[PDB]
Design a protein around this ligand. Sequence first.
Ligand code: ADP
Length: 964
Amino acid sequence: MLADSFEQEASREVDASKGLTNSETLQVEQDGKVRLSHQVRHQVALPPNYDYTPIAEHKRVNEARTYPFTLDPFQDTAISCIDRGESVLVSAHTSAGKTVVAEYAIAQSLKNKQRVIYTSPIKALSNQKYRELLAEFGDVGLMTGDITINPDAGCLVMTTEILRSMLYRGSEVMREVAWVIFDEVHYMRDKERGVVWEETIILLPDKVRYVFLSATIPNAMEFAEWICKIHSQPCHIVYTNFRPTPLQHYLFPAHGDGIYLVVDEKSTFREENFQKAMASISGDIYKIVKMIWKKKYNPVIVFSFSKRDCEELALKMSKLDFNSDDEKEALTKIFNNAIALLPETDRELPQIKHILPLLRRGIGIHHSGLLPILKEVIEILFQEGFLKVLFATETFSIGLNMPAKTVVFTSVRKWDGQQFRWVSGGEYIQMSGRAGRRGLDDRGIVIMMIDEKMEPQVAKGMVKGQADRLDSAFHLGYNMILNLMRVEGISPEFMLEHSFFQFQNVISVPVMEKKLAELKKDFDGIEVEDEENVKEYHEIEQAIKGYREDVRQVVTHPANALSFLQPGRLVEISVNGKDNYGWGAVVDFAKRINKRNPSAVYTDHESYIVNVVVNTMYIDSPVNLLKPFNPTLPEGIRPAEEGEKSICAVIPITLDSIKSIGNLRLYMPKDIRASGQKETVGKSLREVNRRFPDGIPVLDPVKNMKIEDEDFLKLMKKIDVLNTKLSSNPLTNSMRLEELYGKYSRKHDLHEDMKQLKRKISESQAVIQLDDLRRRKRVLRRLGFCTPNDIIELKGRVACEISSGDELLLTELIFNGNFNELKPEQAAALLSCFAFQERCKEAPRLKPELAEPLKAMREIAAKIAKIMKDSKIEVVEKDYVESFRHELMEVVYEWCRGATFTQICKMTDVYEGSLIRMFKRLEELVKELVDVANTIGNSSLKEKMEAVLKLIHRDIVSAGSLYL
RNA sequence: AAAAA
Ligand SMILES: Nc1ncnc2c1ncn2[C@@H]1O[C@H](COP(=O)(O)OP(=O)(O)O)[C@@H](O)[C@H]1O
């Protein structure tokens, strides 16, 4: 249940600004200031019968911590919650000041001789927070996969995975913990890692209190109700849209000299400015940077979609120079101080050598490809303001204390792996946050380079959209299940029942039932149409529609259609059946060869790509974006609707998108698409539609294409049998048919909707993912990881202790003894298959000593995949076997034999940064494979694993962090 | 494509 709900207005005045324009962006005030206001919303979830006092009435007598500045309403409220011992979820933008709240919780815990845990999503963030907190409190420690420092500290900074582990082991630390702070909780919605947060939260004692720090989310109250329900305690939410440094949003149409303000500091969308920007749409990054360095709006960050891009843009800037030699002095000292902390052999590395020149010119690069030490030294140089321009990958925005005055996006679209799509509102929100250093800059500038006549409503949805929901991403894992079986007080079902996924599911039932009710009435508001005899007329037409589709499926099959798609052939295009491009003309076709992915499978209809000329293309469609032989048209590419101009274009399609084939062929220029050739085909297209006003002649499947299979003719006669049966109904000739059909069809639609919804609420009655739990239990029982009564076996106990790699395969390898006759260097090379994920250029064939153990483990892998398949788990057996990459087996092998980093870097195309990260994961995996051999009494194995650790842990691989 | 324990 909810209570104490209030919204509170806040208001300030800011220095007026013209930004990059010529007039004042906002109508100024008498004082010469600009007034901006923001909202602070509060609400609390209460357990049954709880004795609660309104939070605004609370007066804090003793402050556990004081601050130089005056607190914002959202901060004062959140701190009042903590002072009272009540959990709180703080939802605000990155710059707002959520650390102030977390700090107070820490101060309070330390004064009360209690312990407190601070969790973060990323190692990098952990280190930065440890460094920041240590300075302010002193009694601080750090727990991470890499480093452990002062574990007995009052305040522990650790990663969420590390906390998850502690809980399952039931450590004596939690017994003394009063508060647990979750920084960036919204990561709980991560498709792959999100479950870690949920799992961790559920496992916490009801005695502990929480501070959840999150970006602005629309469903914060849901999260709080869930906490309240599973931990039987109050949980507040403090939400605000407050933005410390006001933002200005600009569009930069490519290849132009214009720069347009489209969204001002009041989040007002400038309709006319946007119209001007789109009208001016028909090097640039260089122009823009120069303009920023000139107007003195640096430091600036330029986000690219790939590492490769960040480096190329960097080289195009080494012409410019932003630093005074007095700055180049302090800069280099910092750089060399850090570099000197590396082993002597590594201070000469190429990446280190080639990057310093840029740094001195004041140009930075930042992405996962860099050496860990280069990443942190560049982050530090940015803080001190020695770097005026930083070409960064999308991650930087996540990093704390790395804000910039100006932020530049090089494109309005992004490649998410599946589609080349528009940035979403949610994305863009988190994207705007990186601009504006709280104390230093009046305003923050955001610039987005655009190269397409985007529609207004699409632009609004992106530049002025809503924040994304915090939805559960819960799923089951074997390690998780085994641990829940093992631990005494709880079970796997317990986890399911307490998930936020299950919670959200339960909360939607009333929502769905309300909708059904609306539907039923709407369905009876039609009551009955005139005549039930229209039902027959509807069914007969439905069957015909279906049979006619089957006919189309045959006609368009390559075995029939291809012989009739000569250049110039008239075809009716309908891609996905939702985009009628009307009648186009075949340019050519070709069989589809997937070079990047061999084992990819094409349907017969997908197997051929047909190039087609259409003249119904929407005039503002991004035609420069569709690639050759790629049938997946980007969004924004659509047919023109009523009242829109059209153009000519060649688009790639499959045989599925051919609605019908015409009995005509117009002239197709052999001269490709060249300066006005296809526009003449559009002419011929226009003329043909005039020659045949009634309609375009369709090839007769039987009399022209000669399709006469016994089965196809049986089909073509089922249609006629109906086509007559229909034209003998009193309704075909009757009047008001187009009205009695519409009335009935709508009812039919309501009916279907109600049915499908009825299933939804039915399926939603049971606890979530029980079916999957059952199947995974089979796999575990079958492999002997536990008894049919779900009591954990030795295999299972081992598997629980394995977290850095596939727990099932690794446990099997260990028990089948696949490591017994392997030298340490061999063991390392094999395990790299469990520590490596990214794919790359196929590595040279493996020699016997490495290729053998590989094959012996792929056998065990297949044996497990088959079992996973038998259990009816959605898994591609072969793909699972390949899940474990071996592209670095020879790299790890040699490195364990003394080879230099510079030497192994020449064995692969994998970035230095990626190499180190995987070596560190391998160490982690090995450290786990040592704690295991302890709990198995395999002296032979423990020693071999300990030997692997020494071979790996050396040189640049074992180098420490700059911070700590 | 980019992040990531
Ligand atoms: N009420 C306030 N008035 C002025 N400055 C503040 C206030 N609250 C926080 N700050 C400052 O703003 C900066 C950003 O705060 P911080 O909490 O680090 O960001 P986050 O919201 O990501 O935790 C900090 O350096 C902090 O000192």
